[PDB]
Paper text:
Janus kinase (JAK) family of nonreceptor tyrosine kinases consists of JAK1–3 and TYK2 (tyrosine kinase 2) that serve as triggering kinases for cellular signaling of over 50 cytokines and hormones in regulation of blood and immune cells and metabolism. JAK2 activity is crucial for hematopoietic signaling particularly in homomeric myeloid, and hormone receptors and activating mutations of JAK2 have been identified in multiple malignancies, most notably Philadelphia chromosome-negative myeloproliferative neoplasms (MPNs), where mutated JAK2 drives the disease manifestations. MPNs are clonal neoplastic diseases initiated in the bone marrow from a mutated hematopoietic stem cell. All of these compounds are type-I inhibitors that target the conserved active conformation of the adenosine 5′-triphosphate (ATP)-binding pocket of the kinase domain and show variable target selectivity and differences in clinical profiles. Structural analysis showed that all compounds anchor to the ATP-pocket of the kinase domain of JAK2 by making two or three hydrogen bonds with the hinge region.
In a more open G-loop conformation induced by JAK2-selective ilginatinib and momelotinib, the Asn859-Asp994 interaction is broken. Both compounds form hydrogen bonds to backbone carbonyl and amide of Leu932 at the hinge region and make one additional hydrogen bond outside the hinge, ilginatinib with Leu855 from the β1-strand and momelotinib with Asp994 from the DFG motif. The structural determinant, which aligns with JAK2 selectivity, is a G-loop conformation where Asn859 from the G-loop and Asp994 from the DFG motif are not in the hydrogen-bonding distance. This occurs in JAK2-selective ilginatinib, momelotinib, and fedratinib, which bind the G-loop in an open conformation and also in pacritinib, where the G-loop is collapsed. The compounds also inhibited the catalytic activity of JAK2 in vitro with low-nanomolar IC50 values, and the most potent inhibition was observed by ilginatinib, lestaurtinib, and ruxolitinib. The highest JAK2 selectivity over JAK1 was demonstrated for pacritinib (26-fold selectivity over JAK1), momelotinib (13-fold), AT9283 (9-fold), ilginatinib (9-fold), and fedratinib (6-fold). The binding of momelotinib, ilginatinib, cerdulatinib, and lestaurtinib is mainly driven by enthalpy. Gandotinib, itacitinib, and ilginatinib take advantage of this as the compounds clash with the alanine in JAK3.
Author numbering: 833 to 1132
Write the structure that this text describes.
């Protein structure tokens, strides 16, 4: 009560944060490109600014937690936190980050195939794994690992880009049980997340297996995880029937197919991530080493 937590409300003053572009509407969030020009000279750093879409009390509280999570992370493959802008005369909150100029990995794969080959896909795979190793050291569970939530800095570097669903493990448990779910990315969820709302490092590994699938499908039309799972379950199914069939399919070893052109060894990594036995999934450290060994064992 007596002394409120630190903040730094002068680092990004709203009057000096200049709009450049709308980047996208995620899920209950909106991201802008802005320039922070404290000298009012038309210069300054370009930044990304994440804002809420629906400013309810619950969302503002969750957003503060998300900001604290991102501020606690410093790693080459995690988007860089810069600060907060307490706009509307210090009656609102906006998250300030570095700006990564190629956008989401999902869109980059679809729009920039001219500059993507398997070597790059393996580099991105390795980088995502390393970002996730780092999250695990903080006991953070991402819960939404998907190419749409990874950002592309340049042809040689990706970073995990959004943390809107990330949770902190309890001190005494190796999973977080989510007890008020919002919208759920079911086609990236491990079976125990679908059936028990349990999220862990191991369920992030399951989702990483879906990310790896995404990379090698080159986000081809009809090849996305939702499209392929719906083809397998039945395209006409709606509502909860989708979830019932997805669970039954996964529990009995139904899986996304090997993408066209995907090496057998890379599909093997996918299938090992997609183990119904949580403890038998590889760690992110195992995966980073294996991927980097594959890369390093190539000629040259
Ligand atoms: C919604 C936002 N969309 C978006 C689009 C583009 C873009 C499009 N086209 N081009 C040439 C660039 C750039 C950025 N950059 C950012 C965003 N947040 C922080 C740092 N950088 N974000 C986003 C996407 C994925 C993700 F994981 C986090 C945010």
């Amino acid at each position: 009560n007596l002394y409120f937590q630190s903040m730094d409300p002068t680092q990004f003053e709203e009057r000096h944060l200049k709009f450049l572009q709308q980047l996208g509407k995620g899920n209950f969030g909106s991201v802008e490109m802005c320039r922070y020009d404290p000298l009012q000279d038309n210069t300054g750093e370009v930044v990304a600014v994440k804002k809420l879409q629906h400013s309810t009390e619950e969302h503002l509280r969750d957003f503060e937690r998300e900001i604290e999570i991102l501020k606690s992370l410093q790693h080459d493959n995690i988007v860089k936190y810069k600060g907060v802008c307490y706009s509307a005369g210090r009656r609102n909150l906006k998250l300030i980050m570095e700006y990564l100029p190629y956008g989401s990995l999902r869109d980059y794969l679809q729009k920039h195939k001219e500059r993507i080959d398997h070597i790059k896909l393996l580099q991105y795979t390795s980088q995502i794994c390393k970002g996730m190793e780092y999250l695990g050291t903080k006991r953070y569970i991402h819960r939404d690992l998907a190419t749409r939530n990874i950002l592309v800095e340049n042809e040689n570097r990706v970073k995990i880009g959004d943390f809107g669903l990330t949770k902190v493990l309890p001190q005494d448990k190796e999973y977080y049980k989510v007890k008020e779910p919002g919208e759920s990315p079911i086609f990236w969820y491990a079976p125990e997340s679908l059936t028990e709302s349990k999220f862990s490092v191991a369920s992030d590994v399951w989702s990483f297996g879906v990310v790896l699938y995404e990379l090698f499908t080159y986000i081809e039309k009809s090849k996305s995880p939702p499209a392929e799972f719906m083809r397998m379950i039945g395209n006409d199914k709606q509502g909860q029937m989708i979830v019932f069939h997805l669970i039954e399919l996964l529990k009995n070893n139904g899986r996304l197919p090997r993408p066209d052109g995907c090496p057998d060894e890379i599909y093997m990594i996918m299938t090992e991530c997609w183990n119904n036995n949580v403890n038998q999934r590889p760690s992110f450290r195992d995966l980073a080493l294996r991927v980097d060994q594959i890369r390093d064992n190539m000629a040259g």
